[PDB]
Symmetry: D2
Subunit: 254 residues, 4 copies
């Protein structure tokens, strides 16, 4: 199938190169439209106030001086004579798990892909802070997910957030559908003093009160499972609408 | 009630000052923990790799050199001897509507407020530019906060509020909305910068935009305060049982 | 005279409002062209890859979504129907001293002023942080005093003044002092600490005693409550090195291994 | 000799890998301490408000989540058990010429090298954008040739070399040329265009004919297929201006208005 591949680590990131190579090996057409530089931990929103510069790097590769969402958006709205069936974003050089996902650049690209009407998959390698990162494994996971989606499509308002354990494929215990975890809640605040004497604050390490037990994406990748979290792209809480609608009439009554 | 107020325009933004002032006028205790500078269009994720510096500005105000989520997170996890019942983020100097909301700094602050277990409300003034009625959004805010004291939100839910940049009298009312979508329509414009390079504008949202009745766009366009209850948990639970079968295959045969 | 005022702390910075007002109260005409937000930790170079938006806040104030150099550049190249005699950048909320000067946003605006052929002054408040209030008026007083002088005593070729003002009242100020740039970087060791996770992080330590902050330097001046004025290059070309480098450069033209 | 290699395009940049390898193939020991990501449009100043993470990619390569100056600083102040004789920063994917030099990330790393007492060279490839491939080998060849010379001919006090390499094969290269910094900023007008919405935006225009890119300048050299070597100040202090500024500064000790 026609795959549009982006990332947020940059168009020259080893992750996206290996992902694209893998996807072509599987028989897929792969256009790559990805940031000129690493924009991990940068804002993810579509650039609207300035024009975006996009140079071509090869016949299948574009380097966009903009966000990952800019990339996919440009890629799907005129930058290419290319109608991809799917958007694959990755492979991220770090995992994107739990409440980090909402602000993940890698995920943002996939979200834009779904915003513009395409099945999208975010792929992140859960590299541990410790040797070379097993991008081949995530790429392996990717080409397998893409294949299954060709014959079995995702629901509407849904992308797949995929996290792959930084191990060989043989060492992978398998695929595991998960919900998003939560490490923010537990993470306390640490008051310390920098060398210049200023008071600084560390977001503390996530305590035991973390939502990282069974069923979470954390728990999966921790136990060497490829985590597949189907996530919203529409943030609207429809379940709370009629309840807020009834709440708002009470609000406006007063 | 005890209100924690943040924003993403900065601690000195007129929006947040007016919001805090209003909320105190309503009788609420208001701690303000907000970015040192404008971080609109900056990354929203919790800072973890570096420590955050937070100076106190007054007895109720903290200037945090970090993200809006850093602000609320620090504010709720040790920076304050203060247990707020609610987190109000705003007032944003621009509206946060449709598919912009996911990446809104103002919304991010409210998200963290709910992540840490508090009812949260994002407040944005829908300003079109060529003075901005912050007082109106602040009035909308203090009214929303009041109703939440006696009528609480569901779990995994914050309120994304957008207020038309008009006087309160000119406001047609409150309207619960779903998130719109302007991205889909927005095409790509190829143009040439003065130095000759090929540049690309994200085109203006065409008629194919999801901004009709029921959307937050349509509400604020027609001078209604838009209240969109949004997810905090992005997990698509309705797709869990669906994509599991899809996955079982893969987790069975491996190669 | 006509003054173009900028900074890097933002058009809303108290340092620039106070500077501009002081300069107006002194009888100068003052256009303020300054960043929309604080860019004290941003790149200083001219924005070329993208266009720059300039919002006019009032008659004599422009908010520019770009670098301090962008501000001055735009202001001097057609944004304004205005012909300034001098560029004054500041007042920076923090000091800009020694080997920090070269990467200062404040100084960058002054740099661009000189690049475009204008006398320029960077004004920074050496704040040490602690309440009260930042003595921007003091720095402003210094600024209008310095600007008065450049009206009569022109700066030499490719020179701007880097001015640092001790964060004190004007009455406490011992005076003005012409200074050279100090050096604190070499004396700043690398401190190897560990984050909460246990992972090793590296702080750049505070400047030790081996720093170049003795007599004649800007550091020494401002620490002794003296307004420091450092005339600084805008032309980085080490001209006195040209002849020397030329000598072994000529040999390299014989392209070998 | 022992070379500390950095850049601003990132530790994964082809320009720095090729530079480092060339320098090793020349028999130098080479530690690479370079940003984790491309920071070509980032601030250059030392990170002081936060700690810096350094990841060791291999024996002679460190990935640093901080500025180019952070890299060199850390590398020279305790990150490494390594005592380099020279700092070489590059190879930048784009040229760093004239009035742009002062804000160059590449140059910034070299700056910090000199600040910490080391001979330093900034190496940039004057790429003009055309497919093929960026001639980093050419620049690398230039680098190892220049580094060989500084082993024997030491640079003067507070001087680094700003080296720009024409994006050509080594055989096309006409030679090396000692140059002064050119000036394109003054010749770069402000172009007032309008975005799709109709709102007015301001481009900084391309450098017109009034630019300082004539003979003797770095621009002229690289445009004529010459490797440009500009010795540049690391000490921005305009020493030749000290006496002059001192003359009207002493007056200002009359502080009452
Ligand atoms: Mn990434
Ligand atoms: Mn904002
Ligand atoms: Mn500043
Ligand atoms: Mn660069």
């Amino acid at each position: 199938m026609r795959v549009l591949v982006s990332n947020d680590d940059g168009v020259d990131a080893p992750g996206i190169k290996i992902l694209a190579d893998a996807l072509r090996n599987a028989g897929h057409e792969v256009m790559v439209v990805a940031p000129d530089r690493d924009r991990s931990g940068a804002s993810n929103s579509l650039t609207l106030d300035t024009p975006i510069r996009a140079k071509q790097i090869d016949m299948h590769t574009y380097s966009v001086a903009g966000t990952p969402t800019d990339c996919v958006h440009l890629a799907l709205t005129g930058l290419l004579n290319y109608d991809p069936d799917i958007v694959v974003s990755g492979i991220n050089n770090t995992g994107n798990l739990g409440d980090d996902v909402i602000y993940s650049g890698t995920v943002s690209a996939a979200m834009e892909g779904r915003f513009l009407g395409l099945p999208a998959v975010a792929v992140s390698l859960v590299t541990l802070y410790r040797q070379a990162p097993q991008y081949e494994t995530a790429a392996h996971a990717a080409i397998n997910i893409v294949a299954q989606l060709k014959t079995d499509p995702l629901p509407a308002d849904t992308i797949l957030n995929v996290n792959v354990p930084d191990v060989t494929w043989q060492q992978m215990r398998g695929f595991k559908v998960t919900r998003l975890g939560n490490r923010h809640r537990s993470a306390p605040c640490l008051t310390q003093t920098d060398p210049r004497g200023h008071t600084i604050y560390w977001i503390g390490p996530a305590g035991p009160e973390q939502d990282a037990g069974p069923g979470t994406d954390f728990d999966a990748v921790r136990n060497t499972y490829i985590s597949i979290t189907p996530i919203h792209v529409d943030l609207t809480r429809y379940q709370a609408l009629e309840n807020v609608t009834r709440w708002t009439d009470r609000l406006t009554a007063h």
